[PDB]
């Protein structure tokens, strides 16, 4: 318990990163845009305008 207390006091930034930032604001939007552009034929109405 003491070790977990000391470790929680020194890693607040990393904790918030892995719980709130890693997927929702870093990996998911990258994946979503690349996935959409892999499908969706090479027009302009589909590749730029509707995105």
């Amino acid at each position: 318990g003491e070790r977990i207390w000391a470790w929680r006091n020194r890693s607040e930034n990393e904790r918030w990163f892995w719980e709130v930032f890693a997927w929702d604001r870093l990996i998911f939007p990258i994946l979503v845009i690349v996935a959409w552009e892999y499908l969706v034929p090479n027009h302009l109405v589909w590749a730029v305008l509707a995105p």
Binding site: E12, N13, W16, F17
Partner: protein, 239 residues
């Protein structure tokens, strides 16, 4: 008590020193642009300590010393382990830069490949500049020097153990694979010796703080600043 007096005195000394340092910095930025009242003697920015703290230390020191009197060098063998003002790993940096440049030239003339001499001379030049800035370990260049030196030796180790050397290509495919040879081992010894001595400088450069570090901070303006930066300026601060 006698135990809270010490706390008070350490707080006071630390605060006096911080204010004198802020003064040196702001006076330098005001004198390098003209607006200084012309009684200002620009040699004051060299007094490192503080006038008050210095007078206290001098008085205490003279009182202590007054009340207590109520190769090889056979007169001091431990001459290296003495503070001369420069980084310990300083002659190693220059030695390694010389070795790198010499090996680069030798091997790249004795073979005809253009890569080893370019790598060796670049490494030598950067390590020589680093070993120059490491000659005053108290200042800020004395810290950026160790930074540059560690970076260069690390890049050397990386290239060696992951891509290998162009002039060491052969016909087989398991023999021309990158292993760790002498120069990589020396560069690794250098990085380790740098890290085990002092690389603790310039410690205020890191990734910025999250809204996760200011959750329990005791200050509202700072936390609002951090939230605003990271994109949460509208969230309500029921705090």
């Amino acid at each position: 008590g006698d135990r809270m007096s010490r706390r008070l005195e350490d707080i006071n000394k630390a605060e006096r020193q911080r204010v004198w340092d802020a003064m040196r910095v702001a006076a330098a930025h005001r004198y390098a642009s003209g607006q200084m009242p012309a009684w200002f003697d620009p040699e004051w920015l060299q007094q490192e300590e503080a006038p008050l703290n210095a007078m206290d230390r001098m008085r205490g020191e003279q009182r202590r010393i007054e009340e207590q009197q109520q190769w090889w060098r056979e007169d001091d063998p431990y001459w290296p382990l003495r503070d001369w003002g420069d980084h310990p790993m300083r002659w190693w940096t220059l030695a390694f830069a010389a070795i790198m440049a010499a090996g680069g030239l030798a091997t790249s003339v004795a073979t005809g490949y253009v890569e080893p001499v370019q790598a060796g001379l670049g490494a030598g030049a950067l390590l020589a500049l680093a070993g120059a800035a490491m000659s005053d370990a108290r200042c800020v260049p004395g810290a950026l020097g160790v930074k540059l030196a560690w970076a260069v030796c690390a890049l050397i180790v990386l290239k060696e153990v992951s891509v290998g050397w162009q002039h060491k290509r052969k016909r087989r495919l398991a023999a021309s694979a990158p292993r760790l040879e002498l120069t990589g081992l020396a560069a690794a010894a250098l990085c380790a010796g740098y890290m085990l001595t002092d690389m603790s400088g310039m410690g205020e450069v890191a990734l910025p703080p999250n809204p996760g570090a200011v959750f329990k901070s005791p200050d509202v303006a700072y936390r609002a600043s951090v939230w605003q930066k990271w994109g949460y300026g509208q969230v309500q601060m029921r705090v």
